[PDB]
Design a protein around this ligand. Structure first.
Ligand SMILES: *[C@@H]1O[C@H](CO)[C@@H](O[C@@H]2O[C@H](CO)[C@@H](O)[C@H](O)[C@H]2NC(C)=O)[C@H](O)[C@H]1NC(C)=O
Ligand SMILES: *[C@@H]1O[C@H](CO)[C@@H](O[C@@H]2O[C@H](CO)[C@@H](O)[C@H](O)[C@H]2NC(C)=O)[C@H](O)[C@H]1NC(C)=O
Ligand SMILES: *[C@@H]1O[C@H](CO)[C@@H](O)[C@H](O)[C@H]1NC(C)=O
Ligand SMILES: *[C@@H]1O[C@H](CO)[C@@H](O)[C@H](O)[C@H]1NC(C)=O
Ligand SMILES: *[C@@H]1O[C@H](CO)[C@@H](O)[C@H](O)[C@H]1NC(C)=O
Lengths: 150, 99, 50, 50, 216
């Protein structure tokens, strides 16, 4: 376990230096002694100790959230592709409804999505086969009634 | 909001067409994912030299983690742990140590 | 199974919450429990519940 | 007369992009990531902001 | 020596597609009309690495071959070496250290693949060492100043090293010129054309006139 160092560390960094901590006013000059302590110390673990000092194993994960061509997720199975009809779709965790049709927009090889003014999705790339598709909202409108006196 | 309507024109609501089918698409990677190598490994590293591992190109299954003994701490920030199986990820980094 | 009262309680979905006993979000009621490990414990475990 | 109104119709689109202090602007991400018990703390901000 | 920058150094902010629109963003860029250090080949010292580096090179026989980044340089830091003629990049990222006068007569990654212009941007953020690159022939030939015009850069490589860095030196061959520029946080505006490429950028921290463009 580390004990002494001049100042804290930025996140996601490591340091295994063996320089002597200059606690005292005298210049240690790389010599261990009084007020010149060794940076590391050791813990102890005995089976009869209390739970307050028993050892614990800890693991930390980290994510990236669909900002690139994805590579890892669950065992959900695919299906055949249908177009020119009003359909519900799910591409890599991006869900939506609408109509898919063949397009002709040209992308750079590393690109994966297409947006617009309203930050909504407009063009996607099928991860199964390299070709480009776009989304169009399904038809809708308003209705009115004309009538004479009841 | 009445029983009588006068002569004229009125506007009531709107109409939208409904879908009829469901479509999903995922990459066709079918390699078992190596979570085994880290969770139930034998000896872990030291805190001052903490060890990390990179995981990519695999199919995950986060339910198997429940096979262990009653945990002391199991928490998440930013994602509800229940639906982890319904999201796709790009790269995975896993750090381990003992405290 | 102890903390599984949370499943009995309104909240997140789960096996006990959905397939054993459910309470809606707008439900008005209460859940009380006594630790029965002092009593229900038997030799070689208890297998009288499913 | 033809100009001003057109502009007054464009800005109303752009306000659809601001996050209003929520987790994300897209409305499907919140329901695809969080849980039903806690998404209501977030949806309210977007509804009021619009 | 010193020389004018002449409106260079713009790269894509992210890996998303747009078309026929005006956008505004903020990031670590190179301010327009900034003086830049200059060197000639025989004078090859170590230069600071404050907050990211803009590197540019004119050569035809590929004298420049590699980079070394570190703080104390006691054989305990990463290095980058290449074997490329024009368009075949080979990268090794081990921690081998040469002598105190390097020249040409964890290893988390490895890859093997006059009328030239090489341009690179090295950036460091949160344990990540992002590398953006661009290659372009120049029909300008030798004149007094850096070639004029406008272009865009693309992102190439990421690496999760995570080590504090303060100084860097280049690697030359022995038996061409280059420049070094410093980065800075700033906010720009960009225009995305019809065919999906950047064609114009505007600052709003340079002159009183441009502030009106940025706010309008
Ligand atoms: C990397 O480490 C060096 C020293 O190891 C840091 O240098 C510091 O620079 C500031 C600015 O001049 C000084 O006030 C400090 O005294 C220096 N540190 C020491 C120990 O002398 C540098 O800041 C570190 N990198 C980053 C990004 O913080
Ligand atoms: C953007 O790309 C389009 C093609 O997708 C270019 O339009 C074509 O230009 C060629 C000339 O090189 C013409 O022969 C074609 O008839 C054009 N296409 C159509 C559909 O008319 C366009 O020129 C490109 N943009 C720019 C600025 O050059
Ligand atoms: C699987 O995905 C790859 C990725 O490009 C694709 O080339 C291939 O056609 C797909 N199908 C099979 C059976 O490999
Ligand atoms: C680790 O080993 C234990 C042995 O009982 C097993 O139950 C567990 O599933 C293993 N971990 C993984 C991720 O397979
Ligand atoms: C940059 O350095 C040159 C060197 O002479 C100097 O003339 C100039 O004022 C400096 N600043 C700018 C903005 O060019």
């Amino acid at each position: 376990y580390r004990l002494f160092r001049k100042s804290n560390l930025k996140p996601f960094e490591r340091d295994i230096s063996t320089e002597i901590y200059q606690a005292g006013n005298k210049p240690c000059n790389g010599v261990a002694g009084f007020n010149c302590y060794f940076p590391l110390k050791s813990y102890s673990f005995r089976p009869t100790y209390g739970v307050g000092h028993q050892p614990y194993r800890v693991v930390v994960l980290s994510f990236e959230l669909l900002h690139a061509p994805a590579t890892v997720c669950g065992p959900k199975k695919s299906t055949n592709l249908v177009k020119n009809k009003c359909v519900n779709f799910n591409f890599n965790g991006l869900k939506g409804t609408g109509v898919l049709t063949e397009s002709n927009k040209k992308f750079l090889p590393f690109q994966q999505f297409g947006r617009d003014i309203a930050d909504t999705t407009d063009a996607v790339r099928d991860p199964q086969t390299l070709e480009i598709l776009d989304i169009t909202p399904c038809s809708f409108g308003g209705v009115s009634v004309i009538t004479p006196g009841t | 909001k009445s029983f009588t309507v006068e002569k004229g024109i009125y506007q009531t609501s709107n109409f939208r067409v409904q879908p009829t089918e469901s479509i999903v698409r995922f990459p066709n990677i079918t390699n078992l994912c190596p979570f085994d190598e880290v969770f139930n490994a034998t000896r872990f590293a030291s805190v001052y030299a903490w060890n990390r591992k990179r995981i990519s190109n695999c199919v995950a299954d986060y339910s198997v983690l429940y096979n262990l003994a009653p945990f002391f701490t199991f928490k998440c920030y930013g994602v509800s742990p229940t639906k982890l199986n319904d999201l796709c990820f790009t790269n995975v980094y896993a750090d381990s140590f003992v405290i | 199974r102890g903390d599984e009262v949370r499943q009995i309680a309104p909240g997140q979905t789960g096996n006990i919450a959905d397939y054993n006993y459910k309470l809606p979000d707008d439900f008005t009621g209460c859940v009380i429990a006594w630790n029965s490990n002092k009593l229900d414990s038997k030799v070689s475990g208890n297998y009288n519940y499913l | 007369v033809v100009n001003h109104n057109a502009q007054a119709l464009n800005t109303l689109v752009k306000q659809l992009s601001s996050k209003f202090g929520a987790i994300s602007s897209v409305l499907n991400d919140i329901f695809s990531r969080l849980d039903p018990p806690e998404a209501e703390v977030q949806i309210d901000r977007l509804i009021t902001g619009r | 020596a010193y020389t004018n920058s002449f409106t260079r150094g713009v790269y894509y902010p992210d890996k998303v597609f747009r078309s026929s629109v005006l956008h505004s963003t903020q990031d670590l860029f190179l301010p327009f009309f900034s003086n830049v250090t200059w060197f000639h080949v025989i004078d090859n010292p170590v230069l600071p690495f404050n907050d990211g580096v803009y590197f540019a090179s004119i050569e035809k026989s590929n004298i420049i071959r590699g980079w070394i980044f570190g703080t104390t340089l006691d054989s305990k830091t990463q290095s980058l070496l290449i074997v490329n003629n024009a368009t075949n990049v080979v990268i090794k990222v081990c921690e081998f250290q040469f002598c105190n006068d390097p020249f040409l007569d964890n290893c988390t990654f490895e890859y093997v693949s006059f009328k030239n212009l090489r341009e690179f941007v090295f950036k460091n953020i949160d344990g990540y060492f992002k590398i953006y690159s661009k290659h372009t022939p120049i029909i300008v030939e030798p004149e007094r100043d850096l070639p004029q015009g406008f272009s865009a850069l693309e992102p190439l490589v990421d690496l999760p090293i995570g080590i504090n860095i303060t100084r860097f030196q280049t690697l030359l061959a022995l038996h061409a010129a280059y420049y070094v520029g410093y980065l800075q946080p700033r906010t720009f505006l960009l225009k995305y054309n019809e065919n999906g490429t950047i064609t114009d950028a505007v600052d709003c921290a340079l002159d009183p006139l441009s502030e009106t463009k940025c706010t309008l």
